[PDB]
């Protein structure tokens, strides 16, 4: 029974060794997965920061060109209206 | 009267130009709005990511502390089992 | 009195093992919640991106239709202005 | 001369229209370009999330099997400690 008792202590500490080793593999794999996901989030975070920051200068350029475009549009409408008015003048002159 | 035909043509050009300006603005603004929505989405995602990363960095000390406590418990168990085997060997030698 | 030391050591080892299991359950719990939260976040983002990319197609169809309407309105304006010039020349030379 | 400046106004309207089309093509080109860029970024990120989740999901079987084996080793350890306590009560009592 003494031999069996020492055998039981040996078996127990072997089981503890394997349990700790396996749990270390599990923990390392888990933290590895967390690290990969946070890494991907970091990269994406930085790219979005880049695009968000560029939107300011891009919006300034857009506003400049959009003002110039509103100028061209108003000019065309006014040109066509003036055309109509001078045509009216010509027509009433031709009534003579 | 040919003057009436001219007035009709000018009014036609005014209508065409007006619809073209209206459509032009509509296309333009639709594009700008699409860009704005995508930028807003990317900003939300960026802030969520920044929050997760910040929480991980803050709690890293606590996680490492608990892991150290765990490895200490494992080592203590190994030591108690070794002492158990040693004292059992002592008792066996006594008998 | 060495047997009492043996029983005390066995009870101590059992308490140690129980504390290791309790603490390890807290660790595994935290890792599981972290991975689950990040997977939920990335899956939500993946779906939102997929949706925007999916509706970009219909937005491109409407964009194409409206752009064709635009170019037709442009061509029509250029032609109406040319016909206008033609009749203006007709009246001008008629009155000369 | 009211006809000469009518023809002149017609030519001016043609010119203004052509300008407006050029400027608007510039505007729409930079806008559609920005859209293309952000859509390509979202496509890349969507496929990355899909890939990383498909990997975790594919290895969940190995994870679950090693975790079950881990819980098996924990149970084995509690069983061995219990057997030890019992045989040590037996041996202790056989002495006294």
UniProtKB/Swiss-Prot annotation, chain A:
Motif stretch (Nuclear localization signal): 6-9
Q: Write out the annotated subcellular location.
A: Nucleus; Chromosome; Chromosome, Centromere
Quote the function comment for this protein: Major component of the transverse filaments of synaptonemal complexes, formed between homologous chromosomes during meiotic prophase. Required for normal assembly of the central element of the synaptonemal complexes. Required for normal centromere pairing during meiosis. Required for normal meiotic chromosome synapsis during oocyte and spermatocyte development and for normal male and female fertility.
Q: What is known of its domains?
A: The molecule is in a coiled coil structure that is formed by 4 polypeptide chains. The N-terminal and C-terminal regions exhibit a prominent seven-residues periodicity.
Tissue expression: Testis.
Effect on the protein of changing residue 6 to A? Impairs pH-induced C-terminal tetrameric self-assembly
Task: Cite the record's note on assembly.
Answer: Structural component of synaptonemal complexes. Homotetramer that consists of an N-terminal four-helical bundle that bifurcates into two elongated C-terminal dimeric coiled coils. This tetrameric building block potentially self-assembles into a supramolecular zipper-like lattice to mediate meiotic chromosome synapsis. Self-assembly is likely initiated by local proton density at chromosome axis, which is predicted to trigger antiparallel back to back assembly of adjacent C-terminal ends into tetrameric structures that anchor to chromosomal DNA.
Name of the protein in its database record: Synaptonemal complex protein 1
Where is region (Required for pH-induced assembly of C-terminal ends into antiparallel tetramers) located? Answer: 3-96
**Source domain of life:** Eukaryota
UniProtKB/Swiss-Prot annotation, chain B:
Task: Relate the outcome reported for changing residue 7 to A.
Answer: Impairs pH-induced C-terminal tetrameric self-assembly
Q: Where in the cell is it found?
A: Nucleus; Chromosome; Chromosome, Centromere
Record's signal peptide: none
Q: Which domain of life is it from?
A: Eukaryota
- Outline the segment boundaries, as ranges, of region: Required for pH-induced assembly of C-terminal ends into antiparallel tetramers: 4-95
> Per UniProt, what does mutating residue 45 to E do?
Impairs pH-induced C-terminal tetrameric self-assembly
Q: Where is this motif: Nuclear localization signal?
A: 7-10
- Tissue specificity: Testis.
What does the subunit comment say? Structural component of synaptonemal complexes. Homotetramer that consists of an N-terminal four-helical bundle that bifurcates into two elongated C-terminal dimeric coiled coils. This tetrameric building block potentially self-assembles into a supramolecular zipper-like lattice to mediate meiotic chromosome synapsis. Self-assembly is likely initiated by local proton density at chromosome axis, which is predicted to trigger antiparallel back to back assembly of adjacent C-terminal ends into tetrameric structures that anchor to chromosomal DNA.
Q: Give the function comment from the record.
A: Major component of the transverse filaments of synaptonemal complexes, formed between homologous chromosomes during meiotic prophase. Required for normal assembly of the central element of the synaptonemal complexes. Required for normal centromere pairing during meiosis. Required for normal meiotic chromosome synapsis during oocyte and spermatocyte development and for normal male and female fertility.
Q: What is known of its domains?
A: The molecule is in a coiled coil structure that is formed by 4 polypeptide chains. The N-terminal and C-terminal regions exhibit a prominent seven-residues periodicity.
Q: What is this protein called?
A: Synaptonemal complex protein 1
Gene name of the record: SYCP1
Report where the shown chain sits in the full-length sequence: first residue, last residue, total length. Answer: 676 to 767 of 976
């Amino acid at each position: 029974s003494m031999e069996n008792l020492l055998e039981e202590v040996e078996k127990a500490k072997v089981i503890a060794d394997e349990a700790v080793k396996l749990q270390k593999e599990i923990d390392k794999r888990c933290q590895h997965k967390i690290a990969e996901m946070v890494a991907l989030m970091e990269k994406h975070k930085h790219q979005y920061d880049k695009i968000i920051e560029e939107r300011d200068s891009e919006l300034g350029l857009y506003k400049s060109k959009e003002q110039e475009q509103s100028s061209l549009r108003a000019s065309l409408e006014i040109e066509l209206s003036n055309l109509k008015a001078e045509l009216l003048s010509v027509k009433k002159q031709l009534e003579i």
